Amino acid sequence: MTEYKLVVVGAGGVGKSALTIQLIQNHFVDEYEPTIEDSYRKQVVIDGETCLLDILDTAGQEEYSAMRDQYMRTGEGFLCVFAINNTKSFEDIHHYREQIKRVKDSEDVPMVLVGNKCDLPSRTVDTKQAQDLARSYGIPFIETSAKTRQGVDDAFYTLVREIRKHKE
Ligand SMILES: Nc1nc2c(ncn2[C@@H]2O[C@H](COP(=O)(O)OP(=O)(O)O)[C@@H](O)[C@H]2O)c(=O)[nH]1
Ligand SMILES: [Mg+2]
């Protein structure tokens, strides 16, 4: 039984809490909208193997978190979330990745660039410049919507595979 530590990073309001809940939710609770950072557990199967995912939904750069740096020491991979309708959230990705590289003293850190809210037709961040940013960091790019559940499982499963590929 292999565990995986995942950290969800991004500006405030990009949907990090909403993406993490849609993966985790067993739908016992109708709707649950967290406000405080927290960690959550989910069993998944990737390429034959069972996998326990610890998912930490961090607060944005706006909010203070005492454990912020420790979360990144613990994190094995990272979901970098912006919203495709907030251009500053896209520009903030450079800071969060730079912050990960500082705490982890490394560039080859398993990450996945994630452009949330793919349901809003007010698309300001083109898919092509998002893929370009992902190309420059050497990491996959996945489009998701925590509102329509699309891509949600694909993002997290991609991150776990990055961890696997990095491990060798
Ligand atoms: N249309 C749309 N709205 C979303 C989506 N994800 C989150 N939201 C809304 O964005 C607001 C803030 O999302 P939240 O999960 O708290 O983001 P966080 O600040 O990173 O934790 C909430 O009102 C959500 O309903 C999405 O995928 N599509
Ligand atoms: Mg939140």
Number of neighbours of residue 78 by Cβ within 10 angstroms: 29
Which ligand 1 atom sits closest to the C-alpha of 81? 20
- Alpha-carbon separation of residue 95 from 67, 69, 101 (angstroms): 18, 14, 10
CB 155: neighbour CB atoms within 10 A?
23
Cα gap 15→99, rounded to integer Å? 20
Cα 83 to Cα 38: distance, rounded to the nearest angstrom: 21
Nearest ligand 1 atom, CA 145: 27
What CATH number should be reported for the domain holding residue 110?
3.40.50.300
> What is the domain range of residue 141?
1-168
Q: What is the DSSP letter of 113?
A: E
Q: How far is the CA of 117 from the centre of ligand 1 (A)?
A: 8
Using most ligand atoms within 8 A of CB, pick from 7, 16, 17, 84 the residue to mutate for ligand 1.
17
Listed resolution, Å: 2.5
Distance (Å) from CA 49 to ligand 2 centroid: 30
The count of structural domains within the chain is 1
